[PDB]
A paper describes a structure:
Spermidine disinapoyl/dicoumaroyl transferases AtSDT and AtSCT were expressed mainly in the seed and root of Arabidopsis.
Phenolamides, also known as phenylamides or hydroxycinnamic acid amides, are ubiquitous secondary metabolites in plants. All these phenolamide synthesis enzymes belong to the acyl-coenzyme A (CoA)-dependent BAHD acyltransferases family, which was named according to the first letter of each of its first four biochemically characterized enzymes: Benzylalcohol O-acetyltransferase, Anthocyanin O-HCT, HCT of anthranilate, and Deacetylvindoline 4-O-acetyltransferase. It has been established that BAHD acyltransferases catalyze the transfer of acyl groups from acyl-donors (Acyl-CoA) to various acyl-acceptors. In this study, we first performed structural analyses on two representative BAHD family enzymes, the Arabidopsis mono-/di-acyltransferase-SDT (AtSDT) and poly acyltransferase-SHT (AtSHT), then explored the acceptor-molecule specificity and potential molecular mechanisms of multisite acylation by structure-based mutagenesis approaches, and, finally, successfully predicted and varified the acyl acceptor substrates of two uncharacterized BAHD family transferases in Arabidopsis using our prediction methods on the basis of a sequence similarity network (SSN) and of structure modeling.
Numbering used by the authors:
A (entry chain A): 10 to 57, 63 to 103, 105 to 365, 371 to 451
B (entry chain B): 9 to 57, 63 to 449
Write the structure that this text describes.
């Protein structure tokens, strides 16, 4: 009989005056495919000064550095580009909630239904001036433990930026006076052309159709692939083809395996083209590379097109080859600028059954310490945006308390109930 | 009373041979920042029936014609966080210290129960300078009896125990009148270089472990636990009667390591819901293809980790933990596994990420029983009466080290000695568990 009740929502402003300014964003930031809300729960165990008072104070100091987080995002009808008005002005919503259970009856969110996870996550405050891109919630439990939930405009940051923001927040909450990385803006370094005569590539357009779609009985489950299974899939993949000098990554073999199993589960039109989308960091593709204080979107999506027949008939090694080549092309500066141009064309001009995007958030907890008194979250659960979940499979790391899953990977999959049944059975073949 | 060691001189011993002037790269295993610790060991020699200090200085000078990187300077860039070793420049050489003690070897009982702080009186410090530090240093402490302690210090970034043993044996081979080291040494640290995976986030095992209610404390004690061969034999038999181990035999390292883990979880009273991690090292000399030649003295092992909850460690049988320890060893012996472990270390080095997490439940086993099995060390003052490895101060608190007893203790042939560093309260409980 779980009931989570919000007690309060305050608007928290920067601890120092910010001159009124209007900021522009990068081409990657303005990508209307990226106007989704990232969400993550940080689960803290009880202790042997209340956490919400410490975090609220740190948030106000955090906005001294990350003051664009306190502004308002709005897309201009002239540009169809985003504008961020900060300073004087604003503030980040901060919600405190209580739950009528102990943390342990939720297993530290190790198996949380992603709908149920919404009870611990804030939403973005929307207004005349647009929406504030950042929001925080603290849900206190009867054990004395608590969950720190966060929402963040994906137009504002990627996971790298999200990770530094949250760690800076807990660093300040723990007594540090400065964050360890100073944030920069510099979003004009990722600004594209666009090209007047070139029709843009739109991902998911004209992809293979599924006999099960459209439906509205979609289910989200979290699938676990153990380090044992990952090695044996790598071992077998290396025997089909020695990649010689090069090593094959877990993201590559699992990604290819998810693609195959998804195509078969959705029974995609074998003559139709299916498209694997993968994100590739480009922090070091620009010259000079972006500093660590850069927290805007700093990746581009690569796409591997195959027929559903090809995906179903190719070996795993055959697909890894294409995946590896997709990542190599991402590392060319001249390709990056034509990706940027393509995005800008999509913006300036203003279904996908049939399009499969892999997302990687295993690194959500590596960018610094989150200890500010209650010792390093016992679990970090990223929650896939409702806007994209049907297209997305997300790689995430297990709880640090799950000793039997050390070195394993968890994949959040969203499929029609029919397809999901056949999808789990294909994944069984990994063990 | 008290013990007083007086250093008489330190000179930089240079090679008796011309050596190349190079800036050498190190392997991925060598560049691991967790490996930048200083190995130390005391080699005790009794009096003949003065001379030995001078003979080892000449020997060291001849040794550096072969292991000439040892005379270089170690300095890690901040460009790529990689260590570089610069040899053959001006002012190179190995620090070589001669000291005297105001007591006879008899009164320290050949270092058989030496306190680790006392033992530091016989070990050199590593020479630091604007150009970094030398990886290697020697100290000969002369005693009133006529015997002497050969103390050595060795950066783990330079070698593992296999290379350390070959260097010390080459040093005494030379001092004994031989002209060549019996094994020709090679550098080729390029053989063990990882290729970091662009899309693979770094994985640091055992970074965040179960809490101990005794930590943090300043009240740490180090003690040497002795296990005679017949208790080892009795524990092995009992472990065989829990699980039919096939024709797999169970090793002393596995079964005692498992018992050490259980006892340590109990001694430290770790949060039973938390995760405790057992680390062990697995040589990979023959895992790489081509295999490593015997003259390779760089780091040639990978660390394997067994994670469990502190409650599973207490409830599992000894045999249960042995099956897990054997499984870890099987996986380090996969060539493709070692490539990925190499890639992950490279990625850890390059990202230079913040060190975080509770290390209370991290338990790392080292094995230095093999320190004196690579050759003779007679030159001639007769085969050392004792070889005492000293745990790096940087790792002592999460490390238990296996060592062989002195060669003068007949009652302990087949026996094992374990060096244990725990909070004082935990050491009490720990010694009680060791009593069985």
């Amino acid at each position: 009989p779980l009931m989570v009740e919000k007690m309060l929502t305050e608007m928290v402003k920067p601890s120092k005056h910010i001159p009124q300014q209007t900021l522009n964003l990068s081409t990657l930031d303005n990508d209307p495919y990226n106007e989704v809300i990232y969400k993550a729960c940080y689960v803290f165990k009880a202790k042997n000064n209340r956490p919400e008072a410490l975090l609220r104070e740190a948030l106000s100091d955090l906005l001294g550095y990350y003051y664009p987080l306190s502004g308002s995002l709005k897309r201009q009808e002239s540009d169809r580009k985003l504008q961020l008005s900060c300073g004087g002005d604003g503030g980040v919503p901060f919600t405190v909630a209580t739950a009528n259970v102990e943390l342990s009856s939720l297993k530290n969110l190790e198996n949380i239904d992603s709908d149920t996870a919404l009870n611990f996550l804030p939403v973005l405050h929307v207004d005349i001036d647009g929406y504030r891109p950042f929001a925080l919630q603290v849900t206190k439990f009867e054990c004395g433990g608590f969950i720190l939930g966060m929402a963040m405009s994906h137009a504002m940051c990627d996971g790298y930026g999200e990770g530094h923001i949250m760690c800076a927040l807990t660093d300040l909450a723990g007594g540090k006076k400065k964050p360890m990385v100073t944030p920069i803006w510099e979003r004009e370094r990722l600004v594209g052309k666009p090209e007047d005569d070139q029709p843009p590539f739109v991902p998911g357009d004209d992809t293979a159709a599924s006999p099960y779609l459209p439906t509205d009985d979609w289910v989200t489950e979290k699938i676990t692939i153990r380090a044992d299974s990952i090695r044996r899939l790598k071992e077998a993949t290396l025997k089909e083809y020695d990649f010689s000098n090069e090593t094959i990554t877990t993201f590559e073999v699992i990604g290819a395996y998810l693609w195959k199993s998804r195509v078969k589960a959705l029974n995609l039109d074998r003559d139709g083209v299916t498209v694997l989308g993968l994100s590739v960091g480009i922090r070091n593709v620009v010259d000079p590379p972006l500093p660590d204080g850069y927290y805007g979107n700093a990746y581009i999506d690569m796409y591997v097109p195959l027929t559903a027949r090809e995906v179903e008939e190719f070996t795993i090694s055959d697909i890894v080859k294409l995946i590896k080549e997709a990542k190599r092309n991402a590392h060319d500066k001249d390709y990056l600028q034509e990706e940027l141009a393509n995005t800008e064309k999509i913006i300036k001009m203003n279904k996908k059954d049939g399009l499969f995007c892999l997302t990687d958030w295993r690194n959500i907890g590596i960018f610094g310490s989150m200890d500010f008194g209650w010792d390093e979250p016992v679990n970090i659960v990223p929650v896939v945006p409702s806007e994209t979940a049907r297209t997305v499979n997300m790689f995430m790391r297990p709880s640090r308390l799950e000793s039997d899953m050390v070195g394993g990977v968890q994949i959040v999959v969203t499929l029609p109930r029919i397809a999901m049944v056949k999808f789990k059975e294909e994944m069984e073949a990994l063990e």
